[PDB]
Design a protein around this ligand. Structure first.
Ligand SMILES: Cc1ccc(-n2nc(C(C)(C)C)cc2NC(=O)N[C@H]2CC[C@H](Oc3ccc4nnc(C(C)C)n4c3)c3ccccc32)cc1
Ligand SMILES: Fc1ccc(-c2c[nH]nc2-c2ccnc(F)c2)cc1
Length: 327
């Protein structure tokens, strides 16, 4: 069992193994950059705040640890280490997560080639995540970590609405993985043009900005809408045609525009998947179907369970104990 040391950074206490040196805040739980003396790498360390404050916090704790232990892909955050200063289940009350420090997000960070490489990486990571039956649900520039080599990893820190699928603004319960492809569409647009595609002020403003580009719903999509209030609102708007994307995004590589149209189709059932998007001609320089792996099966049966705080806590403790670092 390693030797821990204690310090206070910005009202927050950090108790981490001596392995980890030069802790300095990055953002806000709360996150520090460190030096990993065992490997010579710079790392990010997340301390979970009050992980067992409520059943919902305890289950969030378990969920993030179970997810981060499963993700083993070049374009998705993975776990280098996980530790607690606690020496017993009874005193277990703090969780720290360690990953590779990339150093910037996509807000911080372009030719056409740079857009190709950045969006290729997002889709290669999303292929992997979607293959585990996980939806990200909050893809946006601030959840995309980029190093000096413009290598990219998808993460989740926990305006969001700007990158959000229109079916989510509408509060449809049965949305599918292509909510994430919508978000990627909004990101690629902003990288090509330098402007937020849909800078809505609220969920109503956001829906109106979206339907101005992609049109109000056609008949095939209206038939799938259960809610009377939702249909009453949408069909009462001034009806709008799909705009000509070649016009809106004039100046962009026409192959980029063609992919944008396949991502930003209003009906989620007609949107391109991540696997299909990787095979699109826009990524000819990067695409290799032998180097676009899928995930091992991911058990999320726990999501339907209703357990006590102490049960979520013991489960979380067994996951910390069983952790095996990557080579
Ligand atoms: C309740 C919950 C919350 C989040 C999740 N989640 N779901 C996922 C995927 C779907 C699989 C994508 C991922 C996560 N959790 C997650 O990503 N953790 C990050 C949060 C950022 C934090 O900071 C980092 C990490 C690396 C890094 N490199 N550069 C910089 C900044 C300059 C932007 N980084 C900043 C972190 C530091 C340690 C260890 C982890 C982390 C799941 C459940
Ligand atoms: F104004 C609109 C109308 C429909 C959508 C939408 C897009 N894809 N799927 C839907 C959908 C499917 C079933 N039920 C719903 F409520 C929504 C988005 C905005």
């Amino acid at each position: 069992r390693p030797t821990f040391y204690r310090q206070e950074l910005n009202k927050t206490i950090w108790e981490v193994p001596e392995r980890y040196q030069n802790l300095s805040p990055v953002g806000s739980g709360s996150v520090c950059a460190a030096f990993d003396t065992k490997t010579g790498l710079r790392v990010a360390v997340k301390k979970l705040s009050r992980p067992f404050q409520s059943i919902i916090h305890a289950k969030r704790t378990y969920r993030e640890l179970r997810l981060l232990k499963h993700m083993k892909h070049e374009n998705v955050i993975g776990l280098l280490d996980v530790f607690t200063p606690a020496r017993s289940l009874e005193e277990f009350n703090d969780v720290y997560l360690v990953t590779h420090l990339m150093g910037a997000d996509l807000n911080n960070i372009l030719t056409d080639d740079h857009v190709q490489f950045l969006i290729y990486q997002i889709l290669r990571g999303l292929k992997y995540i979607h293959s585990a039956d996980i939806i990200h649900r909050d893809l946006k520039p601030s959840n995309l970590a980029v190093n000096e080599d413009c290598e990219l990893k998808i993460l989740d820190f926990g305006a969001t609405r700007w990158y959000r699928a229109p079916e989510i603004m509408l509060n449809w319960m049965h949305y599918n993985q292509t909510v994430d492809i919508w978000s990627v569409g909004c990101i690629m647009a902003e990288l090509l043009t330098g402007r937020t595609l849909f800078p809505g002020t609220d969920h109503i403003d956001q829906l109106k900005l979206i339907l101005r580009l992609v049109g109000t719903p056609g008949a095939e999509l209206l038939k799938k809408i259960s809610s009377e209030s939702a249909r009453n609102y949408i069909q009462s708007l001034t009806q709008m045609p799909k705009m000509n994307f070649a016009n809106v995004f004039i100046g962009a590589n026409p192959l980029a525009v063609d992919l944008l149209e396949k991502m930003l189709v209003l009906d989620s059932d007609k949107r391109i998947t991540a696997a299909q998007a990787l095979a699109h001609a826009y990524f000819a320089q990067y695409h290799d179907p032998d180097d676009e792996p899928v995930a091992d099966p991911y058990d999320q049966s726990f999501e339907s369970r209703d357990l006590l705080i102490d049960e979520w806590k013991s489960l979380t403790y067994d996951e910390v104990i069983s952790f095996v670092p990557p080579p």
